[PDB]
Design a protein around this ligand. Structure first.
Ligand SMILES: [Mg+2]
Ligand SMILES: [Mg+2]
Ligand SMILES: [Zn+2]
Ligand SMILES: [Zn+2]
Length: 228
């Protein structure tokens, strides 16, 4: 029988699925985290792990069962447990991993395993292509500091989808979440930078809410404005 801890999958587009897994921050709510699985021809690409290696391995099993293509690479969007808690599982599987250089630098401080490869960014926020080879339809953008100093975002070419990770909250959210590591001065402008980077995206995917419209962007920014 399927259990509450087992990842759940939602097909967002013909070649894109959301993974959702529930984790436990001690003393706090047990809570859900989303990432993406993208089919690009003969391979699969991932955005973020689950919050644990066990759940990440259950994700890779699903991919094997349901898609049966090799996972060529994963991009992870910041050095927090919900996004990088399954790096060992990825590495055990032979999956090449990539994160903001800054995420890799912060990883030991945040108790996550670093990715194998570092992404760097132009002053525009767009990833340097030499650091993101063969990413297929993944278009990586660093919007500036928000939820964390290192948070990155990923557009999916050939679809209506952009992934804001933990930077973006849905259009009915009442809070930006935990701000202990947030850049409260720049959060609003980074949210806006994200929305300007992926003007085509009509479906906004994020870590802790189900997918929403672009109103999630405007709403998160207008919440952030109140922190300055
Ligand atoms: Mg582990
Ligand atoms: Mg921390
Ligand atoms: Zn986070
Ligand atoms: Zn998060």
């Amino acid at each position: 029988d399927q259990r509450f801890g087992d990842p759940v999958f939602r097909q967002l587009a013909p070649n894109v699925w959301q993974h959702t897994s529930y984790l436990d921050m001690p003393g706090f709510g047990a809570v859900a985290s989303n990432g993406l699985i993208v089919r690009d021809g003969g391979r699969v690409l991932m955005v973020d792990t689950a919050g644990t290696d066990a759940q990440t391995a259950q994700i890779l099993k699903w991919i094997k069962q349901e898609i049966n293509l090799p996972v060529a690479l994963a991009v992870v969007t910041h050095a927090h447990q919900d996004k990088m808690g399954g790096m060992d599982a990825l590495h055990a599987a032979g999956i090449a991993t990539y994160a903001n250089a800054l995420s890799n630098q912060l990883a030991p401080r945040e108790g996550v395993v670093a990715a194998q490869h570092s992404l760097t960014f132009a002053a525009t926020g767009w990833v340097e292509p030499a650091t993101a080879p063969n990413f297929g339809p993944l278009k990586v953008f660093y919007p500036g500091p928000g939820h964390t100093s290192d948070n990155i975002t990923v557009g999916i070419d050939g679809t209506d989808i952009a992934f804001g990770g933990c930077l973006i909250r849905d259009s009915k959210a009442k809070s930006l979440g935990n701000l202990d590591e947030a850049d409260t001065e720049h959060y609003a402008a980074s949210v806006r930078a994200f929305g300007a980077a992926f003007p085509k995206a009509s479906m906004i995917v994020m870590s802790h809410f189900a997918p929403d419209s672009r109103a999630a962007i405007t709403h998160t920014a207008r919440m952030a404005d109140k922190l300055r």
